[PDB]
Design a protein around this ligand. Structure first.
Ligand SMILES: NC(=O)c1cc(-c2ccc(Cl)c(Cl)c2)cc2c1[nH]c1ccc(C(=O)N3CCOCC3)cc12
Length: 287
């Protein structure tokens, strides 16, 4: 609908990142405070590589229309490009799950899981590879709806290939990465499935600080290991079928879903459509 910088009133900071930054604003063109509250994503330090990446990210979100995918509202130019999205009042599923640990049961976690699978299958249909599935990137609309909230690392597959090779300079979410993503930089629907199992793990730990994928893996590798060595030993751990433990209270049938996503053989990993059916079958049994 095109947003004018002069009417985007800053309210607060919703989140930070190395390349991104998200603010809570009020788009009030009438200056009568009847304007809608929106989320604004801006580049922390704008370069030409980050800018071109951001324009590719804006087109990715503009092209996505799904109930479990954050709504795109528009852009805000000067040059200093800003992505306008809908405001989701409850924030990340990461922070929400901690605050309502006591209030969110396994049945409800499976509702969220199911929704994540639906949104992820929608992405696959468009040949988009998320490359950063983590509960931190899932946003809460209300108690009964979560949406995939960021697409900063999302890449479109080549027409001819089923993977995409990319080595982005800087810090990667290595503890959510499939082995082939760590060793060969190959990103596919199957590496997204691996990362999904880490999301499902995250949920069932209720984001307990000590139980996080980095903390659990660093414990397995050794807290003495530093720098480029962490990636090396993680590769070796995953190769020797070293895996995240079953979260406390997690039923064996949910942990099985996790371990199946964490297959070293890319081809024997489940599909998002099969993951959805299983999660829904388990939900229906619990109900
Ligand atoms: N689209 C959105 O509405 C939205 C988007 C992001 C986001 C997306 C991508 C990236 Cl890369 C980042 Cl960093 C952030 C974060 C939040 C969104 N709504 C929120 C409501 C509340 C909070 C929150 O926890 N707060 C702020 C209020 O005080 C308590 C602590 C955070 C968010």
């Amino acid at each position: 609908t095109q947003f004018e910088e002069r009417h985007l009133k800053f309210l607060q900071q919703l989140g930070k990142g190395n390349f991104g930054s998200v603010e809570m604003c009020r788009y009030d063109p009438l200056q009568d405070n009847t304007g809608e509250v929106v989320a604004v994503k801006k580049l922390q330090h704008s370069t030409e590589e980050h800018l071109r990446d951001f324009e590719r990210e804006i087109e990715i979100l503009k092209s996505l229309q799904h109930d479990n995918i954050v709504k795109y509202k528009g852009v805000c130019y000067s040059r200093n490009l800003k992505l306008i999205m809908e405001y989701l009042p409850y924030g990340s599923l990461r922070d929400y799950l901690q605050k309502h640990k006591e209030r969110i049961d396994h049945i409800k976690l499976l509702q969220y899981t199911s929704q994540i699978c639906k949104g992820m299958e929608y992405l696959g249909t468009k040949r988009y590879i998320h490359r950063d599935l983590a509960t931190r990137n899932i946003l809460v609309e209300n108690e009964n709806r979560v949406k995939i909230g960021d697409f900063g690392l999302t890449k479109v597959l080549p027409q001819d290939k089923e993977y995409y090779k990319v080595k982005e300079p800087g810090e990667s979410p290595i503890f959510w990465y499939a082995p082939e993503s760590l060793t060969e930089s190959k990103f596919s629907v199957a590496s997204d499935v691996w990362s999904f199992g880490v999301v499902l793990y995250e949920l069932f730990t209720y984001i307990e600080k000590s139980k996080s994928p980095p903390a659990e893996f660093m414990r397995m590798i050794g807290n003495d290991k530093q720098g480029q060595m962490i990636v090396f030993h993680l590769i070796e751990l995953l190769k020797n079928n070293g895996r995240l433990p079953r979260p406390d209270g997690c039923p064996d049938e949910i942990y099985m879903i996790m371990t199946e996503c964490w297959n070293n053989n890319v081809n024997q990993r489940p599909s998002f459509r099969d993951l959805a059916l299983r999660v829904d079958q388990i939900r229906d049994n619990m109900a």
